[PDB]
Amino acid sequence: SLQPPPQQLIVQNKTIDLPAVYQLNGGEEANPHAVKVLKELLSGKQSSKKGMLISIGEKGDKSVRKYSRQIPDHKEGYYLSVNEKEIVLAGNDERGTYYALQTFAQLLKDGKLPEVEIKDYPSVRYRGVVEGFYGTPWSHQARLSQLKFYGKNKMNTYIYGPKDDPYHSAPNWRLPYPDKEAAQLQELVAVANENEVDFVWAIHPGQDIKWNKEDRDLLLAKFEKMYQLGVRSFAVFFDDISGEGTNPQKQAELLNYIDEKFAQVKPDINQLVMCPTEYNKSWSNPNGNYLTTLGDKLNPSIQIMWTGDRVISDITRDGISWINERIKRPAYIWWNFPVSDYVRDHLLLGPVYGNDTTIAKEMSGFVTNPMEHAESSKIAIYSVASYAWNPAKYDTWQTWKDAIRTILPSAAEELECFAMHNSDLGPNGHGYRREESMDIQPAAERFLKAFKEGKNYDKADFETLQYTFERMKESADILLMNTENKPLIVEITPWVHQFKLTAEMGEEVLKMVEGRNESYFLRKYNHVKALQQQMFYIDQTSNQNPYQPGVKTATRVIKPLIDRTFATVVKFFNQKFNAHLDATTDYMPHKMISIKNLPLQVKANRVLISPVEIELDAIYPGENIQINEISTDGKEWKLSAGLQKAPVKFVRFLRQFVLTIEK
Ligand SMILES: CNC(=O)C[C@@H]1[C@H](O)[C@H](O)[C@@H](CO)N1CCCc1ccc(F)cc1
Incomplete structure (x- = not known):
C-alpha cells in the first residue's frame, strides 16, 4: 500500500534485499533533503563501488541521464525503479526527487524491497493545509510535527493564517512579530524547507485597512519583515469582513501592487494568494459584480481562494465551473473540513469525502482548514494529501484506515x-x-x-x-x-x-x-x-x-x-x-x-x-x-x-x- 497512490505502478513478485553493499551515484548532485532521507535508510553502511548501484538525482544530472525518458515531465514528478541490478531515484526536479524517496521509504518493508516500476506526479499543483481557523492557534511543537507530516505525504503547501493571531489580523497586522514569535517562525520556515513545504504567510488586514499610502506601505513593510525571516510565499485574506475593505477594485489593486513591487522584484518568491470577501457562491451577491471585478483586474498569476457553493461544502464539477468562469482562472480550493470552530464540542474524525474526483485540472490548488486539534486533524490531512495527489484513484475508506494506522x-x-x-x-x-x-x-x-x-x-x-x-x-x-x-x-x-x-x-x-x-x-x-x-x-x-x-x-x-x-x-x-x-x-x-x-x-x-x-x-x-x-x-x-x-x-x-x- 502506497499513500498517495502513484500515477503509474508495475509490481512483480521478486524480493530485493536492501543491499548490504551499495554504490551511491549522484549523492553530491541530488536534492540534499532527498539524499539525507536515503543515507538514513542505509545504516547498512557497507558503501563501496563493489556494491549495488543506487542512482539518485534530478533530470539533467549525470547520475540519471540514462533514465531521462522515463522521468515524467511534470512538476514534482519522478521516476522510481527497483530490480535485481540497480535502484533508480530520479526526480523531474529536486522536490520530485524528495518525493521519490518518500515513496521509496514506504516500499522498504522488513529491510527488503519489492521489484517495482513507478512513474508518478501530482494531479493538483498545490496541496496542503491552511491554518485559517478561529480558536487557539496550533502550538509551535504541533506545527513542527505538521510540517514533517506534510513532507511524508507530499503536501507542498502550508498557509499560516490563524484568525486569532493578533499579528496576522487586526489591528496588529501592522506590527512585526516580537522576537520570540519571530524566532519561532524562522524555525518553522527552515523546517518547512527541509520537508519541501512552501510556507505561505498570510495577512488579514481587511477589517480596519485604509486605502491610503500609509496602510499600503505598512503591509509591504510587514511582508518585507517576514521575508527576512525566510518567508518566500505570501497571502492576503479578505474573508469575514465588512466596510471599505470589501472593495474588489481596491483589493485587486493592492494585490497587483504587491505582485509588481515586491513579488516580482524579489528573486525567489513563489506563491501569491488572496482570499476574496465573497469566497462561496451562497455569499456571492448577484445584484453586484464582486467576483468578475477580481477576475478581470487581479493579475492572472495570483491565486483566488474558494470554499465551494457554501461556507462549508464539498467541491463539485458544476460548482467549480461556476466560480472559474467568473474569476477567469482555476480556483484555489479552501476546503472547510475538518475545521470545527463552529461546533467546538465535537471532534470530526471521519473520512474525507464528497469532493469530485475528476476535476483536478479545474483547480489551482486544494488546501484543508483543520481543527485547532492538530494531531487529530492528521486523519483528514493525510486523506486530502492522498486525494489531492491522485484524485482519480482516491479511496475514501482505505485512506481513512491508512491514516489511522500511520498516526x-x-x-x-x-x-x-x-x-x-x-x-x-x-x-x-x-x-x-x-x-x-x-x-x-x-x-x-x-x-x-x-x-x-x-x-x-x-x-x-x-x-x-x-x-x-x-x-x-x-x-x-x-x-x-x-x-x-x-x-x-x-x-x-x-x-x-x-x-x-x-x-x-x-x-x-x-x-x-x-x-x-x-x-x-x-x-x-x-x-x-x-x-x-x-x-x-x-x-x-x-x-x-x-x-x-x-x-x-x-x-x-x-x-x-x-x-x-x-x-x-x-x-x-x-x-x-x-x-x-x-x-x-x-x-x-x-x-x-x-x-x-x-x-x-x-x-x-x-x-x-x-x-x-x-x-x-x-x-x-x-x-x-x-x-x-x-x-x-x-x-x-x-x-x-x-x-x-x-x-x-x-x-x-x-x-x-x-x-x-x-x-
Ligand atoms: C474561507 N474563509 C472562511 O471560511 C472564513 C471562516 C474561517 O476560516 C472559519 O474557520 C471558517 C469555518 O468556520 N469560516 C467560517 C465563516 C463563517 C462565519 C459566519 C458568520 C459570521 F458572522 C462570521 C463567519
Whole structure:
C-alpha cells in the first residue's frame, strides 16, 4: 500500500534485499533533503563501488541521464525503479526527487524491497493545509510535527493564517512579530524547507485597512519583515469582513501592487494568494459584480481562494465551473473540513469525502482548514494529501484506515472505533453533516422501533449493540494510556472520557431491557442516573470555550439510541409496577416547571432554556437576564436587564432565555 497512490505502478513478485553493499551515484548532485532521507535508510553502511548501484538525482544530472525518458515531465514528478541490478531515484526536479524517496521509504518493508516500476506526479499543483481557523492557534511543537507530516505525504503547501493571531489580523497586522514569535517562525520556515513545504504567510488586514499610502506601505513593510525571516510565499485574506475593505477594485489593486513591487522584484518568491470577501457562491451577491471585478483586474498569476457553493461544502464539477468562469482562472480550493470552530464540542474524525474526483485540472490548488486539534486533524490531512495527489484513484475508506494506522499503529483498531463514532458535526448553522456509526445504524433503528412498538427485537441486533458498547470501552481505556502519540491523546482525552461513559451507560440500559426482576432493574436505573451526572460533569469542566463549551461524542446514532431506549424502558417499568421513575436522559441540577418539556442547559456560568419559572440548585449572585421577577425563595419576589449581584435562586415571567450568574 502506497499513500498517495502513484500515477503509474508495475509490481512483480521478486524480493530485493536492501543491499548490504551499495554504490551511491549522484549523492553530491541530488536534492540534499532527498539524499539525507536515503543515507538514513542505509545504516547498512557497507558503501563501496563493489556494491549495488543506487542512482539518485534530478533530470539533467549525470547520475540519471540514462533514465531521462522515463522521468515524467511534470512538476514534482519522478521516476522510481527497483530490480535485481540497480535502484533508480530520479526526480523531474529536486522536490520530485524528495518525493521519490518518500515513496521509496514506504516500499522498504522488513529491510527488503519489492521489484517495482513507478512513474508518478501530482494531479493538483498545490496541496496542503491552511491554518485559517478561529480558536487557539496550533502550538509551535504541533506545527513542527505538521510540517514533517506534510513532507511524508507530499503536501507542498502550508498557509499560516490563524484568525486569532493578533499579528496576522487586526489591528496588529501592522506590527512585526516580537522576537520570540519571530524566532519561532524562522524555525518553522527552515523546517518547512527541509520537508519541501512552501510556507505561505498570510495577512488579514481587511477589517480596519485604509486605502491610503500609509496602510499600503505598512503591509509591504510587514511582508518585507517576514521575508527576512525566510518567508518566500505570501497571502492576503479578505474573508469575514465588512466596510471599505470589501472593495474588489481596491483589493485587486493592492494585490497587483504587491505582485509588481515586491513579488516580482524579489528573486525567489513563489506563491501569491488572496482570499476574496465573497469566497462561496451562497455569499456571492448577484445584484453586484464582486467576483468578475477580481477576475478581470487581479493579475492572472495570483491565486483566488474558494470554499465551494457554501461556507462549508464539498467541491463539485458544476460548482467549480461556476466560480472559474467568473474569476477567469482555476480556483484555489479552501476546503472547510475538518475545521470545527463552529461546533467546538465535537471532534470530526471521519473520512474525507464528497469532493469530485475528476476535476483536478479545474483547480489551482486544494488546501484543508483543520481543527485547532492538530494531531487529530492528521486523519483528514493525510486523506486530502492522498486525494489531492491522485484524485482519480482516491479511496475514501482505505485512506481513512491508512491514516489511522500511520498516526497510531500501536492502537489503530481502537482509534478506528473511536473515530467511527466521532465524525458527525451535529446540528449547526451551516447545515453541514457527516456520516457516523453507519456500521450499527441499521441494527439500532430496527431494535428501537421493535422495542417501542412492543414487538420482539432480533437477538442479532441486540448483540451487535452489546458488542459495540464493549468495544467502545476497550478502545477508550487503551487510548487513554497510549504513549506512542501523547500529543494526540491530550487532544482527545476529554472526548475519550465521555466516550467511555456513553458505552458504560449503553451497557447498563441494555441490562434494563433484559431486566426480569424489579430489584435488579432499580440498581441499573440508579447506575444510569449516576452516569448521566458524570457526563454532565465532564461537559461542564472540559473544553470550556466561549462558543460551544463541553464534550459531545457519538451523537448521531448511539446517544439517541440509548436515550430513547432508556426513556422507553422506564415508561414500561412505571406502567408495569405503577411507579413514577424519572425518564430524563440528561442530568440537570436546576429545574424549570411551567416549554412544559423544554430542557434546561448549563453552559459556563449560564442557565438557559433550549430555544414560566426557573429554580436553581442554590443561591447565586446574579449578573443579568437576557431574553428574546427574581427571588431567593417562593415567598418574596422583586429586551434585557441586569441583576447587580443580587442573590437569586428563582426566576419568573423562544429564541433565547438566559440567566447569567457569578462563579
Ligand atoms: C474561507 N474563509 C472562511 O471560511 C472564513 C471562516 C474561517 O476560516 C472559519 O474557520 C471558517 C469555518 O468556520 N469560516 C467560517 C465563516 C463563517 C462565519 C459566519 C458568520 C459570521 F458572522 C462570521 C463567519
